[PDB]
């Protein structure tokens, strides 16, 4: 599945 990856990507914000 890609749910988890999608969640982690949405929360990642290293700027």
């Amino acid at each position: 599945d890609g749910d988890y990856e999608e969640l982690v990507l949405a929360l990642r914000s290293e700027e």
Partner: antibody
Amino acid sequence: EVKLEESGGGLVQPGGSMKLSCVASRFTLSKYWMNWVRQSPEKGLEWVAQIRLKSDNYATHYAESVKGRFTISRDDSKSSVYLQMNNLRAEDTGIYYCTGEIFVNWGQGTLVTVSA
Amino acid sequence: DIVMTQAAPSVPVTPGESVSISCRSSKSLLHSNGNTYLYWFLQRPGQSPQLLIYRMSNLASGVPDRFSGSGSGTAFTLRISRVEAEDVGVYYCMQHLEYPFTFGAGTKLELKR
């Protein structure tokens, strides 16, 4: 379904070295930042180190108590991350957990005891 | 050097009643969005910590919907509406706004009887 599994702990002499391993199953490790966190009765939970992805040039960040002595690393093709611990101090005793990027997935932890 | 303060080392609760667990940060955890960089964890005895709440108020998947999290900048509250025995353990907050990530000292939930 995701599983992290750390190994390598045990009893070690002050000033000695020890390398911990963490192997991930059902989890494409290369996509996630990884962390080590340790636990003791003395200090509770302490974040230890972090490693980012290959495209971040594997950037690392460390706790102050551990800078210069611990090296976190990763090998995506072995689905593993590592913590090389040198010049071990008695203060480093505790349970060492590896965790994913957002702290949902944790291993069972491996116990490191530094004593003479 | 963000210090996370959990005033209460323990809290007693009558089963089926509510409880609040507080945490305080020496500095605002609001990142330049509507995002507050605060996690809540539960560590049941003899087990690894597990995530209850991310971004201060979002339930992680699989966490029972009787948990909620709230807060404003520097003061945060984890709430359980109806405590089950599933819920006994140690609750920790953690900030990841800045390196080093830092944990509160934990609040232990005890059942009344």
